[PDB]
């Protein structure tokens, strides 16, 4: 029973979702007209607050709320500790529409209790292939197709409840008042992801994970060790050679992408993300903003020659607190962002990616099996972890879709 989400439009069972055909909405038609003015009622000691993301000081109050409360794995040993420039990266790309971010403080001391977050993305979200395959086998061509237009929708992140909070039912308040200051712009869907299982997912990947530092993720029991490394007289210097990198990239002339790169990078990116069932469309200036290196939060390296980017490669940075260990305060993760590979092998041009994060500090390396993630993962001995990240749609109806017909990547 879901006293919540069985009230929202969204599908309600694996069974449904499996006999799913088109794409196109699950809701009534509603107009902009049709939402409510006023916001959400809420309990008379709480207040609805909308933090300014680009204010140092807003930006640090979310940062402790999620510093404090976000996501931890299921053993509570690691808590993510997304940073502040990273929230203002992430919260404000080009065109954000600053209501989106929706927090709730308590009225009398202004105490932050909860947030969640949406941005807008323009994301092609129509039929997908093997489904448009069966729509022309049935005469059913013009139905499959309604929806291939790129829509421009919701994505939502960050949901937090502060724990002295849980289980009071404040998540679906914030869910549906974010739902109605995005209806109230005119958007009816949105898309999101989560490790958990929710009514209803059309994909759900695996996570991997690559070790750069395993001294330390042994240390902090992220990682262990094979039984076969028992049979070795010293177990943990095997398991640092069997992980090393190179110092330096090996691909002549990567370098860090610049401010000129942005149309070349856009062109081979979108190239390579049309073919995907489900995937981002950027523009210039979304592309500046999600790739551009910022130092601390997102890293991306082209390969140029004779003058002219034909691949390049991003990871953003998320560190995590390590909760029990008393030696390490944090996880430095790298996480393996968007990419494009027209002149050299995938699995070459990732090898540097790992060789950057490593020279840079990083401890390990993730990223769930979307895009083409899965055509690497041996050779660079990425391994599989216990995480599953489920993708969701709100009010779309969209058929089960394998991860590898993914093209977003959730931050
Ligand atoms: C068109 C525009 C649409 C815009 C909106 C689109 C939809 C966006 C949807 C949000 C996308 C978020 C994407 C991310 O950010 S995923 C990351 C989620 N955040 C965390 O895991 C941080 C740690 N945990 C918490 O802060 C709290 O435990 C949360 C806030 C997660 C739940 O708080 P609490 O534990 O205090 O519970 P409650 O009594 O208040 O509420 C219980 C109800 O909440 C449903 N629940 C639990 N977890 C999730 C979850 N991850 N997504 C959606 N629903 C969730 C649960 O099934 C139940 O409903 P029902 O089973 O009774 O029916
Ligand atoms: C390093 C780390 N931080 N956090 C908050 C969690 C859950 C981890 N572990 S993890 O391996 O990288 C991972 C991550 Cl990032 C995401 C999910 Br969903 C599940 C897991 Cl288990
Ligand atoms: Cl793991």
Redesign the pocket.
Same mark, same amino acid.
């Given at each position: 029973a879901?006293?919540?989400?069985?009230t929202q439009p969204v599908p309600q069972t694996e069974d449904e979702t499996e006999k799913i055909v088109f794409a196109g909405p699950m809701d009534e038609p509603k107009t902009v007209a049709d939402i409510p003015e006023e916001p959400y009622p809420i309990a008379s000691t709480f207040e609805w607050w909308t933090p300014n993301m680009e204010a140092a000081d807003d930006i640090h109050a979310i940062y402790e709320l999620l510093r404090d409360?976000?996501?931890e794995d299921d053993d509570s040993m690691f808590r993510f500790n997304y940073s502040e420039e990273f929230l203002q990266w992430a919260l404000c790309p080009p065109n954000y529409i600053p209501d989106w971010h929706v927090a709730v403080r308590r009225k009398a001391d202004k105490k932050l209790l909860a947030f969640?977050a949406?941005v807008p993305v323009t994301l092609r979200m129509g039929t997908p292939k093997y489904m448009k395959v069966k729509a022309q086998e049935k005469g059913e061509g013009e139905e499959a197709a309604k929806y291939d237009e790129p829509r421009h929708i919701?994505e *939502?992140?960050?949901?937090?409840?502060h724990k002295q909070?849980?289980?009071?039912?404040? !998540?679906?308040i914030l *869910?549906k008042e974010?739902?109605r200051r995005?209806?109230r712009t005119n958007?009816?869907? !949105?898309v999101?992801?989560?490790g958990?299982l929710?009514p209803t997912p059309y994909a759900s990947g695996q996570y991997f994970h690559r070790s750069l530092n395993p001294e330390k993720l042994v240390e902090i029991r992220f990682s262990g060790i094979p039984a076969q490394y028992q049979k070795f007289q010293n177990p943990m210097a095997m398991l640092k050679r069997n992980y090393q990198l190179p110092s330096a990239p090996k691909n002549s002339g990567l370098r860090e992408m610049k401010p000129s790169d942005v149309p070349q990078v856009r062109r081979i990116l979108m190239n390579y993300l049309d073919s995907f069932d489900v995937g981002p469309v950027f523009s210039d200036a979304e592309i500046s903003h999600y790739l551009l290196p910022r130092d601390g939060v997102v890293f991306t390296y082209v390969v140029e020659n004779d003058k002219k980017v034909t691949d390049f490669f991003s990871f953003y940075r998320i560190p995590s607190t390590v909760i029990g260990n008393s030696n390490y305060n944090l996880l430095n993760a790298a996480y393996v962002h968007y990419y494009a590979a027209t002149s050299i092998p995938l699995h070459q041009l990732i090898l540097d990616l790992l060789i950057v994060a490593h020279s840079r500090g990083f401890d390990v390396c993730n990223m769930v099996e979307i895009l083409d993630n899965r055509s690497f993962v041996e050779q660079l001995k990425f391994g599989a972890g216990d995480g599953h990240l489920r993708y969701y749609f709100?009010?779309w109806a969209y058929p089960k879709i394998k991860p590898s017909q993914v093209a977003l990547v959730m931050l």
């Open positions: 879901h006293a919540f989400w069985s409360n976000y996501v969640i949406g919701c *939502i992140n960050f949901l937090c409840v909070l849980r289980e009071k039912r404040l !998540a679906p *869910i974010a739902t995005v209806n958007v009816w869907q !949105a999101y992801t989560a958990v929710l709100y009010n």
